[PDB]
A paper describes a structure:
In this study, we investigated a donor who developed a family of potent [name] bnAbs with different lengths of an insertion in a critical framework region following infection with two founder viruses that were closely related and underwent extensive recombination. The bnAb lineage is defined by a CDRH3 length of 22 amino acids (aa), an IGHV4–34*01/IGHJ6*02 heavy chain (HC) and an IGKV3–20*01/IGKJ2*01 light chain (LC) gene. Ab crystal structures show an extended CDRH1 that can help stabilize the CDRH3.
(e) Ribbon representation of [name]-55C with 4aa CDRH1 insertion. In contrast to the 11aa-insertion Fabs, structures of 4aa-insertion mAbs 50E and 55C revealed a more flexible and more difficult to resolve CDRH3. When compared to other V3-glycan bnAb Fab structures, 11aa-insertion mAb HCs (17A, 23D and 50I) most closely resemble PGT135, which also has an insertion in CDRH1, while the LCs of these mAbs are more similar to that of PCDN-38B, with an RMSD of 0.48 Å (S12(A) Fig). The 4aa-insertion Fabs 50E and 55C could not be as readily compared to previously described N332-dependent bnAbs due to their CDRH3s, which are not completely resolved. However, we were able to fully resolve the CDRH3 of another 4aa-insertion mAb 50L and show that CDRH1 participates in stacking interactions to stabilize the CDRH3 despite the shorter insertion length. These differences in CDRH3 stability between the two antibody clades might explain contrasting neutralization potency despite similar breadth. For the 4 amino acid CDRH1 insert, stabilization is less apparent. However, in both 4 and 11 amino acid cases, the acquisition of a triad of tryptophan residues from CDRH1 and CDRH3 is observed, but it is not yet clear what the functional and evolutionary consequences are of this particular feature.
Author numbering:
A (entry chain L): 2 to 27, 27A, 28 to 95, 95A, 96 to 214
B (entry chain H): 1 to 31, 31A, 31B, 31C, 31D, 32 to 82, 82A, 82B, ...
Write the structure that this text describes.
Amino acid sequence: IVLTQSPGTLSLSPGEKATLSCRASQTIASTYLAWYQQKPGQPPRLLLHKGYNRATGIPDRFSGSGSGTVYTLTISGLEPDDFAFYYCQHLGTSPPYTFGQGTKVEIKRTVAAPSVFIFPPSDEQLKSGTASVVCLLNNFYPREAKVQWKVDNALQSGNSQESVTEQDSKDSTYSLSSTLTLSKADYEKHKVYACEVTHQGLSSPVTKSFNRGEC
Amino acid sequence: QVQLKQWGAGLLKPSETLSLTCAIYGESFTGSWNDQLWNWIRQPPGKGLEWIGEINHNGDINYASSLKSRATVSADRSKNQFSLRLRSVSDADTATYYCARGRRAIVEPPANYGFDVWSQGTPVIVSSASTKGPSVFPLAPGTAALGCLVKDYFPEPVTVSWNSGALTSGVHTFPAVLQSSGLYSLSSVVTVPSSSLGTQTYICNVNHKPSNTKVDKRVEPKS
């Protein structure tokens, strides 16, 4: 049984009602559907079992509903502790068991464009035989962002790694680094290094660039 | 008050056999109503929960289809413990591994058809690297950004602070990434006013306890 959760990300303010959906590929009895909450760095925690029954100690604001192929987890008034990931699970009469892919409940806030910065490899690193170029996207919302690396106007692929911070506790934004790695040899064969950023807060893509070896 | 305690090596070289055991406290292996389900679950980096396998009260063992060949699940009933082995591990098997208690009971017992008790989990990281301190390189600068690149260390964690930890406003220390070399790398950045680049010193303090590495790196604007 394939369990598909939606939406991927739910964005809400504290105190609003949250509705999370889990769609099964086939009809399943409600007895066999459970829901879990998980915060990062912590084990999951059972919220509901048998579709609608709250587990021990679970607050009244969590409830379950549905039948057939669609089930729902409702949170009637989000508290700060409720911003987390949620998973549905099919625990039937026998294995195998399946989890949904997860839904993230985040704090909603107004759209914010990222500030973009590019960093050439340091002279200290180049002395080592490696070249790393870092593109920074600072304090943006929503989390969805596109970062494309161009070297001498050639789209780069498979030589970059991204890392994203968790949602900020102060202003509810995200920040993101993209790091392009090439050998020192390849770094010195090219002139123009650019990161192109697309984000809902930018009316057109923002490109930050440098020329290798220019002051 | 049921609890699961997990142990086993979490830093694995590639192709080795992952070996984990959980100890049950507060419950018997079968249960009063012969309904206990002892399960293994993993969570790959940035992905959701994936069910691995189970041994139940009657000794029945079942595995997920994509792991059935490489995995073995067993229990030692004399010590109220159960175990998972997973052979020929690769980067694909890097994950946080949990054991959990479920039940299928047929006053109804609590948490029927749910996993109510979970262990703290083991972070399993597959790398042929040995312990290695990071190299620390500067990322040089109305608003100016600067930072440090903390590259090629093993294992986690690294702590990064700025001016000995005084500075946290506008600091972003990014979750580390595992590079293809088996070595971690991360960057730590801070956005500061441009007008402070000549009066305030910015130093990134990097501590890597496994290698006893301690690096204080001044990040200065280039001229």
